[PDB]
Design an enzyme around this catalytic site. Structure first.
Site, mmCIF file in Angstrom:
data_model
loop_
_atom_site.group_PDB
_atom_site.id
_atom_site.type_symbol
_atom_site.label_atom_id
_atom_site.label_comp_id
_atom_site.label_asym_id
_atom_site.label_seq_id
_atom_site.Cartn_x
_atom_site.Cartn_y
_atom_site.Cartn_z
ATOM 1 N N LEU A 109 -6.341 5.799 101.531
ATOM 2 C CA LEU A 109 -7.162 6.552 102.481
ATOM 3 C C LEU A 109 -8.597 6.088 102.487
ATOM 4 O O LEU A 109 -9.171 5.872 101.437
ATOM 5 C CB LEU A 109 -7.166 8.033 102.157
ATOM 6 C CG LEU A 109 -8.189 8.760 103.036
ATOM 7 C CD1 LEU A 109 -7.603 8.960 104.425
ATOM 8 C CD2 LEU A 109 -8.475 10.109 102.425
ATOM 9 N N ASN B 155 12.408 25.342 96.537
ATOM 10 C CA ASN B 155 11.057 25.817 96.657
ATOM 11 C C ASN B 155 10.174 24.701 97.231
ATOM 12 O O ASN B 155 9.230 24.919 97.949
ATOM 13 C CB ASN B 155 10.524 26.190 95.245
ATOM 14 C CG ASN B 155 9.158 26.817 95.238
ATOM 15 O OD1 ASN B 155 8.110 26.147 95.165
ATOM 16 N ND2 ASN B 155 9.131 28.096 95.516
ATOM 17 N N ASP C 102 -3.530 7.478 109.418
ATOM 18 C CA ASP C 102 -2.363 7.939 108.718
ATOM 19 C C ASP C 102 -1.658 9.036 109.546
ATOM 20 O O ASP C 102 -1.941 9.212 110.724
ATOM 21 C CB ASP C 102 -2.641 8.241 107.233
ATOM 22 C CG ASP C 102 -3.286 9.566 107.042
ATOM 23 O OD1 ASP C 102 -3.571 10.294 107.948
ATOM 24 O OD2 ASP C 102 -3.422 9.905 105.806
ATOM 25 N N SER D 213 6.873 25.429 91.786
ATOM 26 C CA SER D 213 7.908 24.440 91.664
ATOM 27 C C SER D 213 7.737 23.742 90.323
ATOM 28 O O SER D 213 8.676 23.295 89.681
ATOM 29 C CB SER D 213 7.720 23.345 92.714
ATOM 30 O OG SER D 213 7.301 23.916 93.905
ATOM 31 N N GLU E 243 5.012 4.147 101.870
ATOM 32 C CA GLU E 243 3.744 4.039 102.571
ATOM 33 C C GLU E 243 3.648 2.909 103.526
ATOM 34 O O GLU E 243 2.754 2.882 104.348
ATOM 35 C CB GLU E 243 2.657 3.784 101.535
ATOM 36 C CG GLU E 243 2.468 5.031 100.680
ATOM 37 C CD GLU E 243 1.875 6.213 101.406
ATOM 38 O OE1 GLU E 243 1.408 6.172 102.521
ATOM 39 O OE2 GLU E 243 1.852 7.273 100.658
ATOM 40 N N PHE F 184 -0.113 10.657 94.419
ATOM 41 C CA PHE F 184 -0.641 9.597 95.222
ATOM 42 C C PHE F 184 -0.870 10.063 96.670
ATOM 43 O O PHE F 184 -1.893 9.857 97.269
ATOM 44 C CB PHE F 184 0.355 8.415 95.190
ATOM 45 C CG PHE F 184 -0.150 7.143 95.832
ATOM 46 C CD1 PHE F 184 -0.684 6.084 95.095
ATOM 47 C CD2 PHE F 184 -0.019 6.978 97.207
ATOM 48 C CE1 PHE F 184 -1.067 4.889 95.700
ATOM 49 C CE2 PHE F 184 -0.477 5.817 97.835
ATOM 50 C CZ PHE F 184 -0.932 4.742 97.076
#
Ligand SMILES: [Cl-]
Ligand SMILES: [Cl-]
EC number: 3.2.1.17
Length: 162
Positions: free
Chosen positions: A32, A132, A20, A117, A11, A104
């Protein structure tokens, strides 16, 4: 290597409001602030979060405080989720870190379209789940990150991060 170092690599760290990769206001280590186009709105969310009149800027310590909370909330969100908890519990520590990274970044909501998945992962079919997972907007939008996370699930090692 751990969840904190892992996400901090993914990040980055920014001390001033930024957009972002989806164009949302964010600050710190991927926190965020708001999905709104309004910066003021974003500034209000920031002050609220920090507990002061930040003026769109925070210190390294405030960033790290937000990050602790956010990682803590991601875990807890997994555990509270009925469909996630069991996948999560079936996994080793490394792969669990991979799951927390995705939660996250995308919220419990985005991770929830990974049902198939996840069911492969539960069954420990690593190579297939990796394939996948690549068929996704997620991989399409942030491919280098997606790749790192997917290898992690795939291998159960930190290689993509070393
Ligand atoms: Cl907050
Ligand atoms: Cl990327």
């Amino acid at each position: 290597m751990n969840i904190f170092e892992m996400l901090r690599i993914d990040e980055g760290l920014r001390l001033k409001i930024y957009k972002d990769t989806e164009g949302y206001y964010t600050i710190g280590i991927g926190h965020l602030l708001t999905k709104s186009p309004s910066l003021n709105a974003a500034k209000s969310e920031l002050d609220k979060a920090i507990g002061r009149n930040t003026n769109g800027v925070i210190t390294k310590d405030e960033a790290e405080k937000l990050f602790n909370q956010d990682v803590d909330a991601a875990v807890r969100g997994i555990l509270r989720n009925a469909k996630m908890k069991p996948v999560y519990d079936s996994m080793d520590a490394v792969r669990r870190a991979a799951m927390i990274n995705m939660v996250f970044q995308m919220g419990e909501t985005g991770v929830a379209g990974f049902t198939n998945s996840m069911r492969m992962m539960q069954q420990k079919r690593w190579d297939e789940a990796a394939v996948n997972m690549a068929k996704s907007r997620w991989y399409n939008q942030t491919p280098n990150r997606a790749k790192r996370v997917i290898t992690t699930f795939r291998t159960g090692t930190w290689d993509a991060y070393k």
